[PDB]
Coordinates of C-alpha atoms in Angstrom, one line a residue:
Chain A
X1 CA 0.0 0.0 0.0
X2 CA 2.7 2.9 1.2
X3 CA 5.2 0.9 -1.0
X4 CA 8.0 2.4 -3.5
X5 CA 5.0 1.7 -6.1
X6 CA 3.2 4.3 -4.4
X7 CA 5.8 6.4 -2.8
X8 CA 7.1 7.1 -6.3
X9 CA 3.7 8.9 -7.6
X10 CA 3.8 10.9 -4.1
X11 CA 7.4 12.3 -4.6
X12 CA 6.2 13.4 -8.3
X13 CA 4.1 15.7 -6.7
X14 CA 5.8 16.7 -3.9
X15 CA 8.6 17.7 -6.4
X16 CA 6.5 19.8 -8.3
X17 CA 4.5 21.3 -5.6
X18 CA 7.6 21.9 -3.6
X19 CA 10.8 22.3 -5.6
X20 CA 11.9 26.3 -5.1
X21 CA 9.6 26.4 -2.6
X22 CA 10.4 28.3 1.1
X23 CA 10.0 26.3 4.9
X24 CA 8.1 28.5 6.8
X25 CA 7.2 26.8 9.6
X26 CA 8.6 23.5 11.1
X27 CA 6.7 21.7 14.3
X28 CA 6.8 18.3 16.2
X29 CA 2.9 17.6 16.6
X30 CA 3.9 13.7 17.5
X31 CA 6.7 12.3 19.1
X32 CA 7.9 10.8 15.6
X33 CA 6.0 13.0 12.6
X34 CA 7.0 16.5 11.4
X35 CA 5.3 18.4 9.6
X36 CA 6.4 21.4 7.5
X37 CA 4.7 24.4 6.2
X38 CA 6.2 25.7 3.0
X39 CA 5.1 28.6 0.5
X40 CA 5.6 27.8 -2.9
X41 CA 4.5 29.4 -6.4
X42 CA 2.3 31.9 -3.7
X43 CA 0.6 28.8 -2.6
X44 CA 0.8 27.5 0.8
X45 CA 1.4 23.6 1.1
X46 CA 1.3 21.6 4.7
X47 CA 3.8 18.4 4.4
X48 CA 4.0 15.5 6.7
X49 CA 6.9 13.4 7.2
X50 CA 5.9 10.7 9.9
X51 CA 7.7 8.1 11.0
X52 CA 5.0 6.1 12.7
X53 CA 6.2 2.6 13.8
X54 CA 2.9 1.1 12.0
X55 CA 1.8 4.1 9.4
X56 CA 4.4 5.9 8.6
X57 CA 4.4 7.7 5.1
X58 CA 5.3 11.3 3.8
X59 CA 2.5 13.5 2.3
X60 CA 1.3 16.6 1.3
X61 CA -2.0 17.0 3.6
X62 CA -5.0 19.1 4.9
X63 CA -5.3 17.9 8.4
X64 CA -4.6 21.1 11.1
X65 CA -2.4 19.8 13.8
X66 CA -1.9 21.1 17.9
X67 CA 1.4 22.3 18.2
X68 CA 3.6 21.5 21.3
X69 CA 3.6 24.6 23.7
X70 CA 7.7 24.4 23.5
X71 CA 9.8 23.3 21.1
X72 CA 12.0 20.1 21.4
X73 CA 15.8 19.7 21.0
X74 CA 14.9 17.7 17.7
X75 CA 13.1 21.0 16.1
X76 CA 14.9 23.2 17.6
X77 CA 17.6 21.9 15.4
X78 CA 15.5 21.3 12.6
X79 CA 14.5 25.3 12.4
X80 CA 18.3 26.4 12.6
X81 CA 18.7 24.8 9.0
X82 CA 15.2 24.7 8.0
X83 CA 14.0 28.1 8.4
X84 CA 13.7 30.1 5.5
X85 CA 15.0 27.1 3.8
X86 CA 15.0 26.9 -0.3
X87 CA 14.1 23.3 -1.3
X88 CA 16.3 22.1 -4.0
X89 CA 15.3 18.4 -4.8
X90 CA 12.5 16.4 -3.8
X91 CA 14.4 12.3 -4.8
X92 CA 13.1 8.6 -3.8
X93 CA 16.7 6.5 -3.5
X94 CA 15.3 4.0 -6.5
X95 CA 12.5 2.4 -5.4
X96 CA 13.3 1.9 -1.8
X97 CA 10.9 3.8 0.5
X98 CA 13.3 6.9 0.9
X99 CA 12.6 10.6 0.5
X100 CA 15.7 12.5 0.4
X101 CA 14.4 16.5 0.9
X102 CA 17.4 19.0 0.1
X103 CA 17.6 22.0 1.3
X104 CA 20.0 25.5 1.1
X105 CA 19.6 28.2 3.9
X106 CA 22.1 30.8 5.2
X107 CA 23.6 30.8 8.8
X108 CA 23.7 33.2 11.5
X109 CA 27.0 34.8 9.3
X110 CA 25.6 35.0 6.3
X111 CA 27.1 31.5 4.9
X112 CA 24.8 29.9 1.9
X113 CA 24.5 25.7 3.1
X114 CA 23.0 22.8 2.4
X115 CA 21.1 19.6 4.4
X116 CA 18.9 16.7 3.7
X117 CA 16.1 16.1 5.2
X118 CA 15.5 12.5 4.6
X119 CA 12.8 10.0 6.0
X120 CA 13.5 6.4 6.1
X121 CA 10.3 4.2 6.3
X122 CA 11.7 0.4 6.6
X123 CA 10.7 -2.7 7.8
X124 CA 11.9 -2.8 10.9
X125 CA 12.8 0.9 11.7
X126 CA 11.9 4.4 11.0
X127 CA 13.4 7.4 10.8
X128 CA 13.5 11.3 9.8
X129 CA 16.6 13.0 10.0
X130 CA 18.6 16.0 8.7
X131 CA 22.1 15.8 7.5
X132 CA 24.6 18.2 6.5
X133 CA 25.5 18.0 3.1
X134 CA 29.2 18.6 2.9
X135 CA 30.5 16.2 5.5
X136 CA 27.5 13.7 5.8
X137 CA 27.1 13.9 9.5
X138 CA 23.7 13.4 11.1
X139 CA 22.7 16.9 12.7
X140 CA 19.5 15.5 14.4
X141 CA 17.3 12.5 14.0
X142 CA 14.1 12.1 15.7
X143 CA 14.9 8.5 17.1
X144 CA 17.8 8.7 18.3
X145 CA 19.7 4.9 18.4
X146 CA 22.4 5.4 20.9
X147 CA 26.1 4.5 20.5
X148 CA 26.6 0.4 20.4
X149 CA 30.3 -1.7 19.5
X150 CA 30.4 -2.8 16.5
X151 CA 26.8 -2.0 14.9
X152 CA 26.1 -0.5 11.7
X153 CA 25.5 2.9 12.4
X154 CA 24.9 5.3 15.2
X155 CA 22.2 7.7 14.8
X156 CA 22.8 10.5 16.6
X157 CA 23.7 14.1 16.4
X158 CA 27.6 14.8 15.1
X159 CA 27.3 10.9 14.1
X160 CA 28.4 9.9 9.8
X161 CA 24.5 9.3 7.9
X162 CA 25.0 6.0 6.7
X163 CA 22.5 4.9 4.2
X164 CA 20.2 2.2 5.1
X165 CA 21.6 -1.7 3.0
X166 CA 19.6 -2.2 -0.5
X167 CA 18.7 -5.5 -1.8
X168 CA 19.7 -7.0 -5.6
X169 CA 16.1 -6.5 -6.6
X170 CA 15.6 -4.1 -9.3
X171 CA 14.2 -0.4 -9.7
X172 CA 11.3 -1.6 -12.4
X173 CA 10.6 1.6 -13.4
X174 CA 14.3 2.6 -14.4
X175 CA 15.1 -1.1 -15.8
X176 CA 16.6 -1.5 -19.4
X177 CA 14.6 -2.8 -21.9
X178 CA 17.6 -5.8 -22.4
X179 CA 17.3 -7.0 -19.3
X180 CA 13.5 -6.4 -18.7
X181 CA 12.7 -8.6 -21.5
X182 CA 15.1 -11.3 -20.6
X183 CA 13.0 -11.3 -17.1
X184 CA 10.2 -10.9 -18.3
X185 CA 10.6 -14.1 -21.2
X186 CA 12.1 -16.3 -18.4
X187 CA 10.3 -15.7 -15.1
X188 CA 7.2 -17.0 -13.6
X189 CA 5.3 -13.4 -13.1
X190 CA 3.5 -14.3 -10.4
X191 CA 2.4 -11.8 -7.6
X192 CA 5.5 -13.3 -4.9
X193 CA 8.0 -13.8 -7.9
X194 CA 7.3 -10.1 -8.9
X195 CA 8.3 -8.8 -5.2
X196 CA 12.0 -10.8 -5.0
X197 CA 12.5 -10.2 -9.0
X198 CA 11.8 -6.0 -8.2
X199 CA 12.4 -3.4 -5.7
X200 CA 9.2 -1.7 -4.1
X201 CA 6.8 -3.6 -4.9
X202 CA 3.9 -4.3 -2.0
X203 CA 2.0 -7.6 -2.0
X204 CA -1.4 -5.2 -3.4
X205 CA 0.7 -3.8 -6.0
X206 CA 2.3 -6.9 -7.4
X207 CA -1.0 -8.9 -7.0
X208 CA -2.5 -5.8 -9.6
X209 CA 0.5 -6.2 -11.9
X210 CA 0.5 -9.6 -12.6
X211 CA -3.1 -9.4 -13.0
X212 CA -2.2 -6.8 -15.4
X213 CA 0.1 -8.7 -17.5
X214 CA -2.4 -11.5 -18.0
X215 CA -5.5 -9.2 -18.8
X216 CA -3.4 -7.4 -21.5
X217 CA -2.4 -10.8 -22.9
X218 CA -5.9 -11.1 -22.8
X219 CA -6.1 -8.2 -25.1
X220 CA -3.5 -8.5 -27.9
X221 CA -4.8 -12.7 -27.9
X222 CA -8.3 -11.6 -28.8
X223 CA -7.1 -8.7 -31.0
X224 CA -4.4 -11.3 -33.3
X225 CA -7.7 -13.3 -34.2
X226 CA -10.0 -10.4 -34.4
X227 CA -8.1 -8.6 -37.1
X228 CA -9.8 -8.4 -40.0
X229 CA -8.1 -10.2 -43.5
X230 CA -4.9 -8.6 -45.2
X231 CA -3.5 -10.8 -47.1
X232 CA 0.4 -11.0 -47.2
X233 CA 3.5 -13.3 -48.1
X234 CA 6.2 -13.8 -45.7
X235 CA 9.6 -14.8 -46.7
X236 CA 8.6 -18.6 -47.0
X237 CA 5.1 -18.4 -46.6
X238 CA 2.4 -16.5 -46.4
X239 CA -0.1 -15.4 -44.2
X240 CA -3.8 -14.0 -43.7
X241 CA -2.8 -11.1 -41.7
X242 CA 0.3 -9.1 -41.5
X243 CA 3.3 -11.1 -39.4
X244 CA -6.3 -8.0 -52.4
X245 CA -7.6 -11.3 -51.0
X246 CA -6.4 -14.6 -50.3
X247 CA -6.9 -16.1 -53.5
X248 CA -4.9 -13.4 -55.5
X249 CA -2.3 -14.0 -52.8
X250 CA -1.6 -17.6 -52.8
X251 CA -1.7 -17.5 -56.8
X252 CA 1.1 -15.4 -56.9
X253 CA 3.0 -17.8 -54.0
X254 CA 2.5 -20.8 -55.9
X255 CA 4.9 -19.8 -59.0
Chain B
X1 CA 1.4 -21.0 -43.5
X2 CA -1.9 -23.1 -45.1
X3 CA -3.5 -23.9 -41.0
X4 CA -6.5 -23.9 -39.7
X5 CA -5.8 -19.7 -38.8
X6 CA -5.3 -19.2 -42.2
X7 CA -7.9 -21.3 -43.8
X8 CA -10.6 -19.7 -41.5
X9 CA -9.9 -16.3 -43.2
X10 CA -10.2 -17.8 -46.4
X11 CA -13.5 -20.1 -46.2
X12 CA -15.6 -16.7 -44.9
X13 CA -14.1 -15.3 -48.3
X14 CA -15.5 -18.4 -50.3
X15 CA -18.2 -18.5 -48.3
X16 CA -19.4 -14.9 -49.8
X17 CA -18.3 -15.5 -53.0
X18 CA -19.7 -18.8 -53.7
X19 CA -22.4 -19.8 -51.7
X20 CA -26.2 -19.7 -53.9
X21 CA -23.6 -20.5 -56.7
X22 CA -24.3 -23.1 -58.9
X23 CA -21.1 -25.3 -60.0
X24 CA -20.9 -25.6 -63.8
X25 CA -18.3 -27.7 -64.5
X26 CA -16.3 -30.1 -63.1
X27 CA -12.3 -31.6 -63.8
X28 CA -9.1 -32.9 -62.2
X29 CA -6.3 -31.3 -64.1
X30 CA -4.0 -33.2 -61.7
X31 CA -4.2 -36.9 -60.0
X32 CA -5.1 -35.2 -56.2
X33 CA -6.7 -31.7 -57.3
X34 CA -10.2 -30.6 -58.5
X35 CA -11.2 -27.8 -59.9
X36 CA -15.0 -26.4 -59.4
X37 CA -16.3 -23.9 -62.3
X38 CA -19.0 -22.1 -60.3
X39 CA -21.1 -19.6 -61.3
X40 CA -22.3 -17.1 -58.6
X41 CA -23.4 -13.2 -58.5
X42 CA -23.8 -13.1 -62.2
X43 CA -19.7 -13.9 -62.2
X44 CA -18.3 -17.2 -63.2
X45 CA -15.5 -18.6 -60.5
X46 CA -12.8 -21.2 -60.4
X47 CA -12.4 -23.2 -57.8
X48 CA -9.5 -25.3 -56.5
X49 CA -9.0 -28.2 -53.9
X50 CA -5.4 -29.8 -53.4
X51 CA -5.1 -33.0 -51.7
X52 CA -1.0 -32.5 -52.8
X53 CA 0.9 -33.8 -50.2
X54 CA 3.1 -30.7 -50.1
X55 CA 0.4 -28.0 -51.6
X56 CA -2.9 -29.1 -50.5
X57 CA -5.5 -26.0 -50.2
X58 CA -8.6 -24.6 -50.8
X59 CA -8.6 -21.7 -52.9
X60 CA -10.1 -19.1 -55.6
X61 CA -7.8 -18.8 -58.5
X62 CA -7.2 -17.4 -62.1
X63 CA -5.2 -19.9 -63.4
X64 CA -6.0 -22.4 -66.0
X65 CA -5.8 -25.8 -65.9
X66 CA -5.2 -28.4 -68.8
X67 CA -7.9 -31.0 -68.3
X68 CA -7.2 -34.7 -68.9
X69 CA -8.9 -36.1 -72.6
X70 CA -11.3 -38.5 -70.3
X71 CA -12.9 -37.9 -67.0
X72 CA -11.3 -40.2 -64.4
X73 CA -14.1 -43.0 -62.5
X74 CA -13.4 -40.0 -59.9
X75 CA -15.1 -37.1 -61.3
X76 CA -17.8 -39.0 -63.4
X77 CA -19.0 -39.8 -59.8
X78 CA -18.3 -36.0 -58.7
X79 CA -20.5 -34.8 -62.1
X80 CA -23.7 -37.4 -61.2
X81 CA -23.5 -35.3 -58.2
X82 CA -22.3 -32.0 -58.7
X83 CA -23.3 -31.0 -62.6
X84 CA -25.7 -28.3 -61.9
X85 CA -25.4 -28.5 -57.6
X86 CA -26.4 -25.3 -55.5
X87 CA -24.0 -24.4 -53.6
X88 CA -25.5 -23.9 -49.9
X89 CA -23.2 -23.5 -47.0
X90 CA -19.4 -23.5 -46.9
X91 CA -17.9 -24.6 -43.4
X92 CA -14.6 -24.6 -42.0
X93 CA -15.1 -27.5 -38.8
X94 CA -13.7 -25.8 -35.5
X95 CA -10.3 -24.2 -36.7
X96 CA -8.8 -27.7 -38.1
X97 CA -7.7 -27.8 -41.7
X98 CA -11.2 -29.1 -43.0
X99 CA -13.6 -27.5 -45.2
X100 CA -17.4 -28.9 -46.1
X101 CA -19.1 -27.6 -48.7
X102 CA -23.1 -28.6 -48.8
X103 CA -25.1 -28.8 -52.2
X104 CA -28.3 -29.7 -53.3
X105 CA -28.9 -30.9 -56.9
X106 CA -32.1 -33.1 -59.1
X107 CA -30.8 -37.0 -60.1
X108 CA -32.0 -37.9 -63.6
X109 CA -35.9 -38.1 -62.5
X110 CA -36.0 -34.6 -60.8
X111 CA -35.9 -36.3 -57.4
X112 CA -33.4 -33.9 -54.9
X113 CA -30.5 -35.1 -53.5
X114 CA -28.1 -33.4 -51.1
X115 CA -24.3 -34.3 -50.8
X116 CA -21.0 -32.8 -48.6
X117 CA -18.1 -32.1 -50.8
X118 CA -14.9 -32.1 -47.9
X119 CA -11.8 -31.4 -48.4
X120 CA -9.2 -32.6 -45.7
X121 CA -5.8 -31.0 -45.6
X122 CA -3.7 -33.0 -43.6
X123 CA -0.2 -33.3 -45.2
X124 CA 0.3 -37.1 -46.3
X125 CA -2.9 -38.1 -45.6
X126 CA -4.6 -35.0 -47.6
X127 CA -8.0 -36.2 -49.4
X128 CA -10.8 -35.0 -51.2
X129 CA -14.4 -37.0 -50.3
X130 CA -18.2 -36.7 -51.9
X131 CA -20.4 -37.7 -48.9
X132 CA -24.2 -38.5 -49.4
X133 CA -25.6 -36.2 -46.9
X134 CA -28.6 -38.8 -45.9
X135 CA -26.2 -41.8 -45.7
X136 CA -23.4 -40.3 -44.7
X137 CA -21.3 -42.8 -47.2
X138 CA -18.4 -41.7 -49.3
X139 CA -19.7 -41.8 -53.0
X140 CA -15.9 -41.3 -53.8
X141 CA -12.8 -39.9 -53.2
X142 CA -9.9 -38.5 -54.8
X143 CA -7.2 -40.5 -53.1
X144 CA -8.6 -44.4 -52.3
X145 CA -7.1 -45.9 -48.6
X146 CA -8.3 -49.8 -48.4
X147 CA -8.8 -51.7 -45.1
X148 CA -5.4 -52.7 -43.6
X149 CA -4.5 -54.1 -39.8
X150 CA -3.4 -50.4 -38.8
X151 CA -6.4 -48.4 -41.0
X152 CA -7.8 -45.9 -39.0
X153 CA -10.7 -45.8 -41.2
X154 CA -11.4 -47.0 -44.8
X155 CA -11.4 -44.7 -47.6
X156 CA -13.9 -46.4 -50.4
X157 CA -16.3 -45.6 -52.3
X158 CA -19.3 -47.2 -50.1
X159 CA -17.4 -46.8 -46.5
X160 CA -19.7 -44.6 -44.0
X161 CA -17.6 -41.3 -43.6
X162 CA -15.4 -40.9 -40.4
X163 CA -13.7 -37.5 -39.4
X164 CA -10.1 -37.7 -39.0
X165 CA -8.5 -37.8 -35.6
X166 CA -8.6 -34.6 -34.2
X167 CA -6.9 -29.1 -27.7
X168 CA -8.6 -25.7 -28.1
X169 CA -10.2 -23.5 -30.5
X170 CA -8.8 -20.1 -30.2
X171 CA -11.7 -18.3 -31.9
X172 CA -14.2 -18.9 -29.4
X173 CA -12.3 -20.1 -26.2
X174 CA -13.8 -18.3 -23.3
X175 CA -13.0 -15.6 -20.9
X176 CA -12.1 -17.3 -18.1
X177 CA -10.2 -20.8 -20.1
X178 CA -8.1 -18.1 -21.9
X179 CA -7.3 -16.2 -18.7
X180 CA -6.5 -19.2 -17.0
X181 CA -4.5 -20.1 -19.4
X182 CA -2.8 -17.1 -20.1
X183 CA -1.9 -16.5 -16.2
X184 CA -0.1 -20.4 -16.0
X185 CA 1.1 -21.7 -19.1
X186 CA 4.1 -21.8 -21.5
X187 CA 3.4 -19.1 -24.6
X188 CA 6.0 -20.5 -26.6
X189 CA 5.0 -21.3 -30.0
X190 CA 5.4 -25.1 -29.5
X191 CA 3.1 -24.8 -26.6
X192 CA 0.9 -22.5 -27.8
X193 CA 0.4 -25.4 -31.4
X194 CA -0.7 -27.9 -28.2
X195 CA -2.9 -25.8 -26.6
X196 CA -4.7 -24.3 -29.9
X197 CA -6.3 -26.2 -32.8
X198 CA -5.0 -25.4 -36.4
X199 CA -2.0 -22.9 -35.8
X200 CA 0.5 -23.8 -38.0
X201 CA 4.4 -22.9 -36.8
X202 CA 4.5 -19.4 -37.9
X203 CA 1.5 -18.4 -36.9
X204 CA 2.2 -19.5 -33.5
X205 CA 5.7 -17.7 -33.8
X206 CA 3.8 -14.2 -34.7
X207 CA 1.7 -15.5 -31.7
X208 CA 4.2 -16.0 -29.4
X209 CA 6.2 -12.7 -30.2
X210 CA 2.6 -10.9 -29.8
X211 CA 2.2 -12.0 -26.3
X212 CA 5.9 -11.7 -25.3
X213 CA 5.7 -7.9 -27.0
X214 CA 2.7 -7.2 -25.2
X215 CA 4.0 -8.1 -21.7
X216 CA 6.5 -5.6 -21.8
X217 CA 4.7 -3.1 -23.4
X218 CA 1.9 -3.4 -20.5
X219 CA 4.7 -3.6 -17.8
X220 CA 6.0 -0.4 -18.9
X221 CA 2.6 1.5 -19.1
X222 CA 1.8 0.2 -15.7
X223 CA 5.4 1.4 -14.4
X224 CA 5.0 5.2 -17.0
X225 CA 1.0 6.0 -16.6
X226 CA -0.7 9.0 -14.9
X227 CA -1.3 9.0 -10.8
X228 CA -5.1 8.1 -9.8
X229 CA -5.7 7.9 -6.5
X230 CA -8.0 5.6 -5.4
X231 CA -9.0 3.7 -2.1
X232 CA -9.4 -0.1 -1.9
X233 CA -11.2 -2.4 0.2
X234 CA -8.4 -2.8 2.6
X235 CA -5.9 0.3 1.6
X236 CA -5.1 2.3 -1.4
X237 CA -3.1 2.6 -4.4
X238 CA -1.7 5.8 -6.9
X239 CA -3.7 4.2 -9.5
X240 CA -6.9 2.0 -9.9
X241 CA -6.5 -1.7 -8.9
X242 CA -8.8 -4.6 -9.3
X243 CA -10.2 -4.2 -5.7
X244 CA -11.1 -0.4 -6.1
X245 CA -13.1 1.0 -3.4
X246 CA -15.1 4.0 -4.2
X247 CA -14.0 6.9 -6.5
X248 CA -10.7 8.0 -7.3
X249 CA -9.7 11.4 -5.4
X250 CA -8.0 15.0 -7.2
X251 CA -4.2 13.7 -5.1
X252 CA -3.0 11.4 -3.1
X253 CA -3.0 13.9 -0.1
X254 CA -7.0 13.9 -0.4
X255 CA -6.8 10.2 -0.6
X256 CA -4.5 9.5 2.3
X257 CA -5.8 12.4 4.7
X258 CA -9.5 10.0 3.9
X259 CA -7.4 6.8 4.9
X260 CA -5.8 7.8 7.4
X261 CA -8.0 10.6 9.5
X262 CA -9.9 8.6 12.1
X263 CA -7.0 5.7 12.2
X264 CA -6.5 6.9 15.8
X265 CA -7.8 8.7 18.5

């Protein structure tokens, strides 16, 4: 349902709702969801980033929210790069459920920089966070995951982003057309096959493409014995419909 | 190339040229072909059946034919029958490579007789057969198979017609066989020849390209096509899927402020 499927038609719009837009206001109305208001094209737009342990998502969305009397640590932070902020690019790391937001702002001296703001909806953990372009380093997160030997990363302010690990399944909708068809004329297309064979893909969604891919075989089947007659020779044959009338056809072929 | 695909484009084209005709003359220019002279829509047609091993058809044609100086045993049978016959339905059976071609004619005392003129197109064991319609025995046959310890069925004048031996028609297969069949099996031309009746090899290559062309060509569309956001009975999806619930909404912000606004209190 929220899978890279669908995450990719929301970051279309977010990018062209949002790109060159201005953050106006940041605020913390749950522990784990932010929500941003920005003014773009002289249009205001409210956008959520939630990292929700069971619904998390990012969207654009109506709904007015309490605001917390105080400010936390977390947007506190947020606001110091965020505030005023130009967003530059609105990107989805392939088709991985990851919305990478950045940003340019000037500091207190009068410095133009740039941060990510990047949500990170996976299967076992979420996260929003915003990271400083030029040296990669997490400036706050809003779970923090504290320091721990030998793990994979630390999240935490001052802390290297490192990038949650991608599988070997493919982006379908940047594939090749080489190796596409060579998947596509050897695999089994069913719904589960679909989900290891490509990246994003939730058990809704691949159910509705392999449905997809039979009902349009459906389609050209009916239409190749639909077609109506026009006759034509092959290069050792012949045949009643591309690969005057029949008659004058196989006259000709048999000389 | 000459299948069961191919002959059921050309049987509706006989069928509209010829049937109401009346067949004027009658000849076998070579040992396992006949030739009809048939007279319909105020224009005069030719005719032509093949039982060649190799070339066997039915077919429309402006060729000429040199006849032989004495009508074969063969065709003075075919003439008691066919001399004058009205031509009145022209069938292709299922999509196998068969035609039948009913007539009616008068015997020598004005009494009316009906007879099935079929042509079989089945490489080696191509043949050309008069049936009497009431009896349903061969009155003769162009290419004469005797009893033998292996015959599947007798080929003489006299013998009570049997079809030849004959999977699936692909005209008129259903929805939900095709489907099925679609969603499981192998579409490559060799399995494609053993699920469907009378596709020769290249047809079922053109076929098999068609299918394997239009899978990709749907899997990109699904992957390149324009955001409609709907509900479902369970969730939601950016475009319509086979469980839709409701109607589709103006973005997916609409949509997913719906989904998601009483979720939790």
């Amino acid at each position: 349902s929220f899978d890279g499927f669908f995450l990719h038609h929301i970051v279309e719009e977010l990018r062209s709702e949002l790109v060159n837009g201005r953050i106006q206001k940041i605020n913390q109305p749950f522990e784990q969801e932010l929500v941003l208001q920005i003014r773009s094209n002289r249009q205001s737009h409210r956008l959520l980033l939630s990292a929700h342990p069971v619904f998390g998502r990012i969207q654009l969305t109506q709904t007015t929210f309490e605001n917390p009397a105080q400010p936390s640590t977390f947007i506190m932070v947020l606001r110091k790069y965020l505030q005023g902020a130009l967003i530059e690019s609105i990107e989805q790391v392939e088709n991985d459920r990851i919305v990478e937001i950045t940003v340019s702002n000037k500091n207190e001296i009068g410095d133009h920089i740039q941060a990510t703001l990047i949500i990170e909806i996976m299967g076992k953990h979420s996260n929003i966070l915003l990271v400083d372009k030029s040296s990669h380093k997490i400036l706050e997160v809003i779970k923090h995951v504290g320091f721990s030997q030998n793990s994979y990363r630390t999240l935490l302010p001052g802390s290297t982003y490192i990038a949650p690990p991608s599988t070997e399944s493919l982006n379908p909708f940047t594939i090749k057309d080489e190796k596409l068809f060579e998947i596509l004329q050897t695999q089994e297309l069913t719904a589960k096959n679909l989900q290891s064979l490509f990246q994003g893909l939730g058990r809704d969604t691949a159910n509705e493409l392999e449905r997809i891919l039979v009902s349009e075989k459906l389609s050209a089947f009916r239409n190749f014995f639909n077609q109506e007659t026009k006759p034509c020779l092959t290069e050792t044959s012949f045949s009643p419909v591309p690969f005057a009338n029949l008659s004058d056809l196989l006259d000709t072929y048999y000389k």
